[PDB]
Amino acid sequence: TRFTEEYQLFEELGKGSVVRRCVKVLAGQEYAAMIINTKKLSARDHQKLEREARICRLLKHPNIVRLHDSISEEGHHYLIFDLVTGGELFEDIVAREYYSEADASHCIQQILEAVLHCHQMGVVHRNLKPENLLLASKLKGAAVKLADFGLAIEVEGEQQAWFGFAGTPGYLSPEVLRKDPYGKPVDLWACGVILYILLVGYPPFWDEDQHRLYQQIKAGAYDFPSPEWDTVTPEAKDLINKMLTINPSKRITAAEALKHPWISHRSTVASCMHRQETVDCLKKFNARRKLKGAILTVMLATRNFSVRKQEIIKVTEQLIEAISNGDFESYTKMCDPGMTAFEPEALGNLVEGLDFHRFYFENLWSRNSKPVHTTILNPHIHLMGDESACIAYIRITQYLDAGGIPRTAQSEETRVWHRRDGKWQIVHFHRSGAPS
Amino acid sequence: TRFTEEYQLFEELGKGSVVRRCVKVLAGQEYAAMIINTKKLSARDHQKLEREARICRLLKHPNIVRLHDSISEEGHHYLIFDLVTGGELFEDIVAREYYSEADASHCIQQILEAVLHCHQMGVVHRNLKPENLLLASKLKGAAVKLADFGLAIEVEGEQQAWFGFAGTPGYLSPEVLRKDPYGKPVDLWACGVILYILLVGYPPFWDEDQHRLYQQIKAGAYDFPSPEWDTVTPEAKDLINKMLTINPSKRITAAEALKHPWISHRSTVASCMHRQETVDCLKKFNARRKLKGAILTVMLATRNFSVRKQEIIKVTEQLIEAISNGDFESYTKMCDPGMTAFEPEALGNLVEGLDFHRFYFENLWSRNSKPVHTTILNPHIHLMGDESACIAYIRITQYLDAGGIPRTAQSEETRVWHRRDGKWQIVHFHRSGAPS
Amino acid sequence: TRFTEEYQLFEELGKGSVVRRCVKVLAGQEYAAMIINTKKLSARDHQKLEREARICRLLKHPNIVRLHDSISEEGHHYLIFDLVTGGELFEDIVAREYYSEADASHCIQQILEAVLHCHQMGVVHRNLKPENLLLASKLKGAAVKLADFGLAIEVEGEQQAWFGFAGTPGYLSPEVLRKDPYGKPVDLWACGVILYILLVGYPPFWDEDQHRLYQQIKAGAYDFPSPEWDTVTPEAKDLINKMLTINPSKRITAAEALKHPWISHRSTVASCMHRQETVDCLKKFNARRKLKGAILTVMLATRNFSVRKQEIIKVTEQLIEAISNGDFESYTKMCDPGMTAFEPEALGNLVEGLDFHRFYFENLWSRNSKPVHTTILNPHIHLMGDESACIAYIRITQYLDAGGIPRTAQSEETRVWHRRDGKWQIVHFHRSGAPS
Numbered sequence A, B, C: 001t002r003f004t005e006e007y008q009l010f011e012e013l014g015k016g017s018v019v020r021r022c023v024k025v026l027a028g029q030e031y032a033a034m035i036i037n038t039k040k041l042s043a044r045d046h047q048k049l050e051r052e053a054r055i056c057r058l059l060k061h062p063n064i065v066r067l068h069d070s071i072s073e074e075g076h077h078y079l080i081f082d083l084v085t086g087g088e089l090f091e092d093i094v095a096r097e098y099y100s101e102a103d104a105s106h107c108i109q110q111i112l113e114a115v116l117h118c119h120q121m122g123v124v125h126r127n128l129k130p131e132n133l134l135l136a137s138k139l140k141g142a143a144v145k146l147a148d149f150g151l152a153i154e155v156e157g158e159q160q161a162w163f164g165f166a167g168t169p170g171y172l173s174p175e176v177l178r179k180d181p182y183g184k185p186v187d188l189w190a191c192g193v194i195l196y197i198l199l200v201g202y203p204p205f206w207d208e209d210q211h212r213l214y215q216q217i218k219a220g221a222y223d224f225p226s227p228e229w230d231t232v233t234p235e236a237k238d239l240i241n242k243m244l245t246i247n248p249s250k251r252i253t254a255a256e257a258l259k260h261p262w263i264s265h266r267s268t269v270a271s272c273m274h275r276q277e278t279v280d281c282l283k284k285f286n287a288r289r290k291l292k293g294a295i296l297t298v299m300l301a302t303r304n305f306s307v308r309k310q311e312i313i314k315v316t317e318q319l320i321e322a323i324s325n326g327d328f329e330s331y332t333k334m335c336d337p338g339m340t341a342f343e344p345e346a347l348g349n350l351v352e353g354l355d356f357h358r359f360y361f362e363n364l365w366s367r368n369s370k371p372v373h374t375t376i377l378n379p380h381i382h383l384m385g386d387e388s389a390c391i392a393y394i395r396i397t398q399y400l401d402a403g404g405i406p407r408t409a410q411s412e413e414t415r416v417w418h419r420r421d422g423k424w425q426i427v428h429f430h431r432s433g434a435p436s
């Protein structure tokens, strides 16, 4: 209601809801607005709204984006925190021509600065990860700023509890994997998995079997493989052992991690040799996680297959995301203007793609009411030569019906992909079972 | 509400909603009113309403119709931009007795004038085409005016993006066919396909297989076939190569196209020889596109068949348009006063046409609520002698039901045509499947 | 019953039922056995059985395969006419290094010899065509032998009647296309379309629109296009005009065509110049008709598309033929050992191909009872690069159910093709609608 009058809207920043830059007309200043559609998840979402908004009203640190107001309109809600254009940090670093232990200590310092602040404020972030770490501006000396989300929480003093199972498999502490009570410490363990990538540019734990990754993360199995770690100050490796401590009660606090300066004093005393190889690996990992970290709705069994399969999965995925969100612009991009469907709504007929579907993204399901969580089971992929491929899978869809009751629906889908002009395009689409 | 009191309504101008001339009573002046029925497409439409209305509030150019207000009434909405009676341009030109390079340069100049204005205003038209090009009046020296629609958009400065797949197959730039980000340039490419028709009176690209037309349009395959292009100044051909540039970043801007005057200076320096043959071809093409450009809901496979088939398709089409719109006047015109149906609503009986159907165009589906997108598959046509013919097809119909949920329905239809008095008339009609 | 004891069976010759070589044990001699499965078409078939068997008991010509007996066993019937291994004639001719008017006259002579015999016997073949023309042996001086089928008939003396619409579109006389009574003449007209190919190596009539081909065939529109016909004796061209006569009553009889020897006397007097170009065209046409003449169950609209489409249609076709016949050997050849289905019998699951289907070709529908005529409508094909492709179509299937009543069933199918090792292979298969 009120954000309609005072503010003007401009380009999108990110998506998930949509982030967009705006500027206040009345006292002219830029901000960034979270547009949270009135369709979230009934209750579990609204709860996380007010939590995120409250936490951010409380968190005012020079290294953390601070909110301004949160306005509720008719078909939307708006959250206006502080704006930025900096790119990601793990993205800026690779662009650096001199990366040293001393640039990494400059990072973990600002990081631990945002963290300590809030840990003093009786709040734990729980989701700490490269994605969540960003750069104020691209302008020189821009600050690292912690990204407040959203699996976040308010602890009582130092009291440890069970706040439920949240965060990213690689960024998860053992106390949380053991299903034991936790607290501020589960944040320190992230930093430790973060520092380790902030040096050698690969993660301390990982496995394709996530059951195994977790075992490592519960067993504290990491090591400093030579040669790359040989050029690393033993102080660096010391902090890393203090954060990466299995027992949270023995785990170095955030306050303690600032005082011990393999960062502040190795800024004063550590190795600056530009490690170009680390930086490269880093960049590679980043691209991978961007494409691989695509979605947590993927169920199947493989063993390290052709990255071109992992790419064609990511695509199938990007398409189904457009479908649910009501995003038509993106739907036409990924589909051949000559695409042919076979679908239950077709009533048994074959169709030309760019005629039939318009209706649905127009007024059907496009941004209707409730989230329908989509599950994709046992996909299977055929690769025929360099430019073509086809993918067969079962999509199970959890939605709220008119009554408001939830239902499930399962449809068999085949999709057929042709790469023309470096871009994959959908050509045939074949859907079995019910209408989505 | 307010357009009811101030304005008086008169004859229709065009249709799609309906354009109509009116005059403001209070300060007496003529305008042209878009009557957009409250049934549009739920959301996707309303979005394009406010976009079109906003863009036109912003676009004030001497060569572009300017809006005045946009009024919302109960069962209708009204958009009042500037009025005209000029006929189409590609229509006026053929009527000209002297057409030269210098009349064509006089056109592309005014054109590029409307375009440049808006390109400066951070807006791209995306649909540029003869239809969209009109003449203020039939009065001497009347101005060309760009027709603002509606696949239109607001770019940020010069930033290129993916705005989704829109426009007419012949008028589509390659950057859009390649599914790459685009911007203002996709407008310049249209002008180039426009100039080329504005000289020789046939288009640079075309094929019946639209997959092929697009390949040409992606490959920039056009050439200047002799003799007709032999009498054309090499400056003319120069601009044409600058607009028709495949790479948008290398593509001549609109600002650049005005300064280079194969138009302004060839107005001063170019060929005036009245090319009568070009003008004729032009006129022919026009009629064809008017009849052929009928609708984008046609699916089938043919090879350049008797134009009398292409005419009898256009008709079947004109009829089904009347049906959906609720247009009865037009329905009686195309139907024999002695027409006989066989239809599901007939409950198994044969009927006399002008009794039964009245009910439906009276209160049934006539202008009910929501758009039902009609698809016509694999039509098949029998031609028996000069005056008769019959057409068999499957019509699939996408609508919103009472619940508001979308459904599909497929009906088999046969229609039988008799030409009496130069006009085709429906005589028998046979519908299978469900009631529409 | 009796063919079980006396005869031994060996390799297949052809298929349609199956032809196979055998040898009589008791008086040792080779023959060729038609194995007509007890599933034919109820009555319409059994009628053509006894007709074919009767006609062949009657037709004993040195140039026509003569039957010996026709034995009825439990689950099969056997027809034993005379055996051959000669290859096809239009196939042998191309292999010839000297082809002249005099070799062609040597052919049409033997041909007219088999024809005249039977025309004297009150029987008309009605299906005359390259396929039906074969070579006794590959041994020197092997004889041309007419292949007795099967759209055949017994006329009374010279009385003309309506024997119904049969034969091949190109090989059809006008009196039959006009739907007028006919007789022996409809055989002479074939020879005339045959001679014409027996010289220049392309047919007199043809069009892709079969409505048009028939118009030519009803209008007698053929001409002798220069240069290739320039080197042809005017006698040759004379016979051709006598056979290719529109009015059957004016049409040269078979008896008359033997006496006029542009064949026997031009054997004595005509052009022998080896026409290598004609022979080449011939061979090409042959391959085309073999692949194109595949089946008469194909419905759609195209215009002369990439021969690689015409090839991938022929394949889809070859596969569906294997399915219906119960031919598993052929089914595994055309299918990837890693093929994945999605099918109604799958009960909503994705399967590995070479596990699931065995059951069906084992005891399900494999050679069950009755013919199920398969119709394939509006196929549509996507070509992605050289090695891959996918085809979407609606297959309608006319069968006899348990009751013996006929039913129809329509299924939507997508098939996906990968060429590996010069051979196309099926990889994914997706079937919608009911179980076949």
Ligand SMILES: COc1cc(Nc2c(C#N)cnc3cc(OCCCN4CCN(C)CC4)c(OC)cc23)c(Cl)cc1Cl
Pocket (backbone or CB within 6 Å): A013, A014, A015, A019, A032, A034, A082, A083, A084, A085, A086, A087, A088, A147, A149
């Ligand atoms: C709920 O909070 C979240 C918000 C955000 N999103 C952003 C916020 C906030 N908030 C603030 N500022 C951002 C600035 C951005 O940079 C501009 C990028 C345009 N460039 C144009 C030129 N080309 C060459 C490069 C790209 C940006 O995009 C990367 C995202 C931003 C995210 Cl990503 C996640 C969560 Cl969880």
Ligand SMILES: COc1cc(Nc2c(C#N)cnc3cc(OCCCN4CCN(C)CC4)c(OC)cc23)c(Cl)cc1Cl
Pocket (backbone or CB within 6 Å): B013, B014, B015, B019, B032, B034, B082, B083, B084, B085, B086, B087, B088, B147, B149
């Ligand atoms: C959404 O905007 C659009 C609006 C319009 N429509 C028009 C606007 C507007 N706006 C303004 N002025 C028009 C003047 C016209 O000329 C009068 C024709 C009557 N003549 C009577 C005498 N006889 C011999 C010849 C015909 C006219 O009809 C051809 C259409 C007009 C269109 Cl076509 C498309 C879009 Cl997308």
Ligand SMILES: COc1cc(Nc2c(C#N)cnc3cc(OCCCN4CCN(C)CC4)c(OC)cc23)c(Cl)cc1Cl
Pocket (backbone or CB within 6 Å): C013, C014, C015, C019, C032, C034, C082, C083, C084, C085, C086, C087, C088, C147, C149
């Ligand atoms: C209902 O009557 C019909 C019967 C037949 N079928 C045949 C009859 C009969 N009858 C007699 N003799 C045949 C001899 C054949 O040649 C042997 C080919 C094996 N070669 C092995 C070596 N490699 C290199 C080449 C192939 C043959 O196959 C082409 C088919 C034959 C037909 Cl095609 C159609 C109808 Cl309508």
